[PDB]
Write a protein that binds this ligand. Structure first.
Ligand SMILES: O=C[C@H](O)[C@@H](O)[C@H](O)CO
Ligand SMILES: O=C[C@H](O)[C@@H](O)[C@H](O)CO
Ligand SMILES: O=C[C@H](O)[C@@H](O)[C@H](O)CO
Ligand SMILES: O=C[C@H](O)[C@@H](O)[C@H](O)CO
Ligand SMILES: [Mg+2]
Ligand SMILES: [Mg+2]
Ligand SMILES: [Mg+2]
Ligand SMILES: [Mg+2]
Lengths: 392, 392, 391, 392
């Protein structure tokens, strides 16, 4: 198929621009020019581009240079019609952030980290971005006694409250998306899963402005069900953005093309986002790919991988719809009682008093007979998969 | 050392009573009489005993039988002075619960699950229990299309609000603690980590009556840092109860004696719980051991293992105390700047306007010089381990 | 549709699993063995396997035992099903709580061998060609409780005996050690396919020993199952295979083959079928060692049995199409997959000739070579598209 | 308390020399001078140093430079009395090795990789090294269809056979140690575990010259039991060298100080290596630390961390000795029948026929009665932990 701007496929500058310098080796590709990136991505079907401050403007650029880069960058967007849906700040590369940005043990680093974000918020606001993604990659520890978690959560909250204050007062209208990750680069990162991140956000001053940006690989690094966590995120209404990529369970973060890691879970994820209630998608934000072209590839492999992300999503979408439209699947869903879960356990107006009065819910309930009936889940799964294989 | 009632060590009837029938074999031990279990626990220094409805009263016992059991039980409690600080319900054993209790796709099972719990709340309230633990072991799925998570969270919530209501109205004064687990027995369980449970609890009708009951091995099954997750639970003030045991990373749940799995994390956990703010413990509920005596042991090994849990806790407590009273450790803490995290990042009355005006926070900040100072974390970790090893 | 040439087999204990798990009672009633034979024959299975204790209840008197066997043989006869492999339950009974062959208790070890000898005679009687040995209770929960070195000596001692016996009696059995990292023990001896092959190389008649790797068992450690099978085939030790599905490191799920890591299920079928000639690289039984989920009744059980065969045949078809695609041939050429098969050295070349080749070092432009891409993502993308029936 | 040359502690130049440039950030430490490294290690008690060709001589140095560096290095060893027990080659950093050295799909890379190694073998021999470690970090793949494993193993073997031929012909008397690793940097690496590396070695032309160099964290990345793995390597007599470090389960390779990851396994490991048959160690090679001083530390932190490894090993040794020497432990071992595993299952000269005729081994065997006796394993384990904690 073909991507449309209505699909809202976005990519970070750092994705197709990853030079492939890994933990054990030198870069295998030369640097990617941002203007070219804009052009190349516009060409493959992306509707937007994102970036960290330092991806666009080299750390420690004088004003003139910085200004110079932005102006050229805006031209390219202009020309191509791409937007900047989200912006983020690099609080992990420079040595000063070795112990964190917002929660560094060092107070001077914390103050600096906030200044650095404020400045990116301004550029973001100016480019029309709606979301500020916050990935606290250096927030965490290698040793338990080196970090007071409670104090760290206080300092994290303290920084977020300020950013919300600023944005509201300047009238930027940003939404903030906290990105959880279990480890890498710290032995243990704070807010390790989608869950911890949502619980945290609920403790902020203007919780309505905060959500999460879960990434496929991050949850899989802990062997969690990505689709299920996204389902919980949507239940809470905190899915402000999403990072799509592939991973092969608990190991270093691979950042593969979306659907190149856990294919079955990539399938159910697309089904959840698109086969939303009232026909429509359950999620309307950017479908952002935060992946990395393998170290073994050249610039051609890079564009190939960029396109593979889009094809994977559209092929899966196509099969999720067919699946839902299949009468045999409909019959299987019925036998599995999937929809009976949507009917309240209690009859309208019933409370514990009436439930207690219902002998059929306990005293006269035949648990044994109910326990003998199967749910037909295997058959239902077999049909989903045959839809995925294009075997139906 | 010796355990005192002030230590608040409690054990589940199902721990020392596990007959050791595992997934691949038959029981290796005969059943333990509840009265006998009360006497033996009292003798090793436990202050309380806990149980699932079905551990005490065999599933489907007539009222005369049940009444007889309860009465004999109360006598033992009376005679020994042990208390029942928490009670729980078995919503996982009987075949009727194969697709869950509160979230089974089948409506009638959902209604029966609630009645089974209400009945247990009554007995709990009569025994003086203050906490009702909820472990939704069957709430989840093996296949993504078999369960509507959103509908499931709705149903979960629907059941829990009723329980709070009933408890409120009857004046039971119970606190509810949801126990997260990532998998086992379902392929994926709903509310997989302490984070997900906390975020969920925040959405109930009366969040104040709800917290979590996190278990050491459950978080380690996902290879998460248990101590750090507890630290976050404490920050939210949602640590209502705790299950202590041992585990060796991501694999089936082993339920070893506390400290026999990740020893270093057990050590930092005891430090966190007992060396709380203001001299005193950061947590005051029961120190509950939800473990299983290894299948290779006989009743002698069973009491040995019951005693090993307490010994382990007391030995680590002793070492945690010594660790903190060491002037050298104190000096390392100061050099690592642990306490400096506790100081707000912003000066009193400082806002973004003032922060933006501080050139020392950015314009004149020497990132490069700060980035070069070491935190001394390794040295601090080494002193901690030397304390644990009794080498200091 | 399955044919006897596909060689699909199932263990009696897979479809017959009552779904009594670590936390709940059984949700299904017992399956009758004759019935299992008839139902499996019906879905296209060519063979059935069993642990001694799955067919003949532990402790049956000879009359009883004899009665059951005669019944079973008759069902085989009628349906035309064979018994390619047999195994022994050395894990259920309490006596085996510390192991069969490597129990600390000498008397259990002796008994463990007697139990297996007995099953060997029955296997021989039924025409089985492979004896699978799953040492599920061999290992430990605590490091000081088990002397690993003495354990391997005792594991070896027991196997050498079994081989002697088989060889003296003319049974012609092949022995396949089944590795598992854990469950039921905290740590099981011979935890991966690699550990088991290395061990087998140390027995008295190594040619008689190989392995029986299980998809889920390697995945429990997060290992690449296909890649381990490739190494097993290279050593020529793939004597049998147990297929099922798993979702990484967690308890063993025993899902239907292909319901866990689908990409790896695809590369595995490609490996086993798109062998050397045009021919399969593996000629043994495709054994499904799985469990129908606890949420299912007997209709679910038969559906899950068929799902295993369906997944393999669907994967096979896509594997074949993948290889026949000219676009794939082109990507394989760009990726230099086949260049790996050409020896690094030219015929008759040794270290002296290599050392004299200035072009292999002194004049080698590493920077230039390091800049060319392998085109692996593109190759991967064509593979997935074949899998999805998108081409 | 103090290290002796008899302890055989070695460190790789790349360990203390790691500048802390990780996957997400820039180096936080300056480069370490090889000569200085030699003096500092000599000073902390190390008996030897190891290096990758490229750690000592910058990739692409002319012979004049190369030669000068070697001469200075040689001097330092001279003055300090340190030896070079092992050398290794870097076949992972340079972009040319992106698909492997010996198993690169590119034939020219394979020829080049062999040449690089032959050269390092020459330097090794000149410095007196006895072991050549081969870590095939880039041998493997991210995608299944990209690598023919069979062909790969043929090419790995082809290369290794030539290396043995050469050493043997030049009379170097080297031993070759293959270092297994499951992943990082490739998605999956060939010879992922100690078991796979041993099986492979058995297929070489002169297998007696080959063994493995297992690393603590490498086996732990797969959640395997490192001690049990070493036990198997010792049974085969293939433990040619060993890399000690710490790791926290399946996640990126942390390379912490030895014993700072799984402490309990670090303990059983020292016990295995040191309490060998008849008092003597079961292993006689170097106790090599292949770790990295955390990114948060400075050079002070670096030397501290170097010493921490030595300390950890000697503290554990000390407790392993005391554990074994304790008559209570000796009694628990007897009760658990640990040594009974050493007695052959079969009586002297007993074969299948005598065993088949022994009614006590089957017909008259009381399995139910034996099945009920406990093994006393929890208690033995508790005794071990108490010795570790310095409580006994
Ligand atoms: O693990 C790295 C993160 O995924 C990163 O790319 C963020 O999303 C942006 O800072
Ligand atoms: O994994 C089992 C659970 O931990 C259970 O013991 C709960 O704590 C109470 O049902
Ligand atoms: O994990 C269980 C094993 O796979 C078992 O079924 C063997 O294959 C036969 O005992
Ligand atoms: O994972 C990195 C390896 O441990 C490496 O240090 C080798 O031992 C030497 O090439
Ligand atoms: Mg991301
Ligand atoms: Mg529990
Ligand atoms: Mg099997
Ligand atoms: Mg190493």
């Amino acid at each position: 198929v073909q991507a449309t701007r209505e699909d809202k496929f976005s990519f970070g500058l750092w994705t197709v621009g990853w030079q492939a310098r890994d933990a054990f080796g030198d870069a295998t590709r030369t640097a990617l020019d941002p203007v070219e990136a804009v052009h190349k991505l516009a060409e493959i079907g992306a509707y937007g581009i994102t970036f960290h401050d330092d991806d666009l403007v080299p750390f420690g650029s004088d004003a003139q240079t910085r200004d110079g880069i932005i102006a050229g960058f805006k031209k390219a967007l202009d020309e191509t019609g791409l937007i900047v849906p989200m912006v983020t700040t690099n609080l992990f590369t420079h040595p000063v952030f070795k112990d964190g940005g917002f929660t560094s043990n060092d107070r001077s680093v914390r103050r600096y980290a906030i200044r650095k974000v404020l400045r990116q918020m301004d550029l973001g606001a100016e480019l029309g971005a709606k979301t500020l993604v916050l990935w606290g990659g250096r927030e965490g520890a290698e040793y338990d006694s080196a970090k007071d978690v409670s104090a760290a959560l206080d300092r994290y909250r303290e920084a977020l409250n300020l950013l919300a204050q600023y944005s509201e007062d300047r009238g930027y209208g940003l939404r903030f998306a906290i990105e959880p990750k279990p480890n890498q680069p710290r032995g243990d990162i704070l807010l390790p899963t989608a869950g911890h991140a949502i619980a945290f956000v609920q403790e902020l001053e203007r919780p309505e402005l905060f959500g999460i940006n879960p990434e496929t690989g991050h949850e899989q690094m802990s062997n969690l069900n990505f689709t299920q966590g996204i389902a919980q995120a949507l239940w809470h209404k905190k899915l402000f953005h999403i990072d799509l990529n592939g991973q092969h369970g608990p190991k270093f973060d691979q950042d593969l093309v979306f659907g190149h890691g856990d294919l079955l879970n990539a399938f159910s994820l697309v089904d959840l986002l698109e086969n939303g209630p009232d026909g429509a998608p359950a999620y309307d934000g950017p479908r952002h790919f935060d992946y990395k072209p393998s170290r073994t590839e050249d610039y051609d492999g890079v564009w190939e991988s960029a396109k593979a992300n889009i094809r994977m999503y559209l092929l899966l979408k196509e099969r999720a719809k067919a699946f839902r439209a299949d009468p045999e699947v409909q019959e299987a869903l019925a036998a599995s009682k999937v929809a009976e879960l949507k009917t309240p356990t209690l009859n309208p107006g019933e409370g514990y008093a009436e439930l207690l009065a219902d002998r059929s819910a306990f005293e006269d309930y035949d648990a044994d007979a109910v326990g003998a009936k199967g749910f037909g889940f295997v058959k239902l799964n077999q049909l989903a998969i045959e839809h995925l294989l294009g075997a139906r």
